[PDB]
Amino acid sequence: MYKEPFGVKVDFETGIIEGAKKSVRRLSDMEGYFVDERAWKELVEKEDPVVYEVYAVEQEEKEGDLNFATTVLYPGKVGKEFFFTKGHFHAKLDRAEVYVALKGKGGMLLQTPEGDAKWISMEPGTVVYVPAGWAHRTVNIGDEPFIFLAIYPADAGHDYGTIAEKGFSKIVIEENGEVKVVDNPRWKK
Amino acid sequence: MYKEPFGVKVDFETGIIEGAKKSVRRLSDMEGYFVDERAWKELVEKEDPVVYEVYAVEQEEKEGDLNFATTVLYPGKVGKEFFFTKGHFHAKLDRAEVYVALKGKGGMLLQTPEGDAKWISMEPGTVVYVPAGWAHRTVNIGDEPFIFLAIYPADAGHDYGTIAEKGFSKIVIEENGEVKVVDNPRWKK
């Protein structure tokens, strides 16, 4: 009645976890996520680039168990908006998460169900505490891949739908060569 | 009713987490842990070196929340035995843990309550999955500090007493210039 311990190699330079399957998110997999839909359509038509890749080592859903995963968030913009992850709440309202930044320049946008927002800058060595109840999205604000490792409860689950429907209350853009976190004009509540 | 997200800087070269207090474990804090008690007494008398330091960022005990901590496990031997951490089970039988090796050369010794053992080699980039129910001890098998980051449930707790009383069923030693994991002669069960 004991699971076998194991070790796996993670390459901090590439984000690749040996033996884990690469899950790929292309821009075409993110319809309705970016503010500039015309820019989205244009970039999908012309290229449809990879926005991010995930390597996950996950256990069966069980209270007390832990998953981990790396993300390689590629550099880019859709109009003014930097490339980002889809973003989600956890399905369980009482499950936190820890991120460890490994490479590149980025940050995390978090929000509560009421839309109260928080931005946390991430550079290599930044550990981010994602408290229970906060939706979380990472953003690449640089010209190189933004790579991090996340450790999360095996029963936290995922709620992508809420973010797919309403988005985040803030967006992260480049204006006149500088990074700005500003009100999302599509956000209601 | 939402905790504030935060980011903290971890130096992967030193293990130091900015703003966290250094908890120091000297050899004198580890009476009855090493097989060669005469060597232990001698080294405590002569020097009483730091065996390891921990930097912890911990939340209040709450189901679903996560702690993280770095350890700097210094190089050394007590007789034939490499420097190691005290080792513990978690108080809760259904709480796993994830370790991320950052610097140096080491490994993890794990065991179940029945004494069934597992050794996992750790070099930078090795992520170790510590399943529920397994006691866990890290060992520095090299000449430089062995540094890692651990992420664990905020309600996992600690049972040091079981290990203090009975020890691990295996010990990690140097014999004729090579690292060996062998039966602990003090182990009973």
Ligand SMILES: O=C(O)[C@@H](O)[C@H](O)[C@H](O)COP(=O)(O)O
């Ligand atoms: O565990 C997490 O929350 C992360 O590993 C994310 O899943 C990952 O960064 C990809 O983002 P998303 O799940 O929002 O598509």
Ligand SMILES: O=C(O)[C@@H](O)[C@H](O)[C@H](O)COP(=O)(O)O
């Ligand atoms: O969370 C853990 O299990 C680790 O951070 C250890 O506590 C740390 O390495 C120090 O070892 P110990 O707690 O066995 O003294």
Ligand SMILES: [Mn+2]
């Ligand atoms: Mn998550």
Ligand SMILES: [Mn+2]
């Ligand atoms: Mn532990």
